[PDB]
Amino acid sequence: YKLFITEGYEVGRVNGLAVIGESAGIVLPIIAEVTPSMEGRVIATGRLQEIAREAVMNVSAIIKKYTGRDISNMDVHIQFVGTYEGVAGDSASISIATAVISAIEGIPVDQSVAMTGSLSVKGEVLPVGGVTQKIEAAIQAGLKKVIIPKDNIDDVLLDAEHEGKIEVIPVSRINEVLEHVLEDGKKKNRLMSKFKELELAAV
């Protein structure tokens, strides 16, 4: 069996990438759900709960500012698929941020696209460690594309055999992430139009 889906579109699920030990890449899928608070909490458990809190708090800033969803009155549940000892995750992981946006908006995410990077509270995608090793894991999982922070482009060093097996997509900002992974449609168009101001503000 496998804990990631390699093709198709799913709401609230993103193929993130992380490292186990010092150097081994893994596909680390994230599933998010948002609910009414019945003040909202970030609900997460385990070794990566701090990363979940970082990502959810940072994405909440951009959601409030640019989309106007009252995420402060929602509970946000973050699930990491596959428990591993010694996982090193991306600070403020963009995969978690993306899963939250997908969940709140009801817009499915392309499972063939893995991603790694850290979300700034301003909507920028900041560099992370282990990019080559994460890309390798994505290739071994049969994923088609991998989003990485633009500032990590020169960190990519793959074998000739692995090069060519995956499309590497460098990004500066969260809206480029959403452009590449969200399912095309009315909902996406509408959301992307709200995020345009983030791009205008950031350039």
Cα 21 to Cα 44: distance, rounded to the nearest angstrom: 22
Cα 37 to Cα 42: distance, rounded to the nearest angstrom: 10
What's the gap between Cα 67 and its chain centre?
18
Identified catalytic residue from 65, 91, 120, 165: 91
Q: Out of Ca ion, its own copies, none, which partner does residue 178 contact, by CB within 5 to 8 A per kind?
A: none
Q: Is 120 a catalytic residue?
A: no
Smallest distance, Å, CB 105 to Ca ion?
A: 26
Q: What is the footprint of its own copies within residues 81-140 (CB under 8 A)?
A: 81-83, 85-86, 88, 91-92, 118, 120-122, 126-129
Of the pair 5, 168, the CB lying nearest Ca ion is at: 168
**Which two three-digit tokens encode residue 77?**
């549940």
Cα 18 to Cα 129: distance, rounded to the nearest angstrom: 9
Q: Is 194 a catalytic residue?
A: no
Smallest distance, Å, CB 168 to Ca ion?
A: 5
Of the pair 35, 164, the CB lying nearest its own copies is at: 35
Does 75 engage in binding with its own copies (CB under 8 A)?
yes
* Type of residue at 138: A
C-alpha separations of 164 from 48, 94, 120, 145, 158 in Å? 32, 24, 30, 11, 9
Identified catalytic residue from 95, 102, 134, 172: 134
User: Phi, psi (5° rounding) for residue 123?
Assistant: 95, 0
What angle is formed at CA 149 by the lines to CA 143 and CA 5, rounded to 5 degrees? Answer: 20
Residue numbers at the binding site for its own copies (CB under 8 A): 1-3, 11-13, 21-22, 31-33, 35-38, 41, 43-46, 50, 53-54, 57-58, 60-62, 64-65, 68, 70-73, 75, 77-79, 81-83, 85-86, 88, 91-92, 118, 120-122, 126-129, 149, 151-152, 155, 201
The catalytic site residues sit at 91, 134
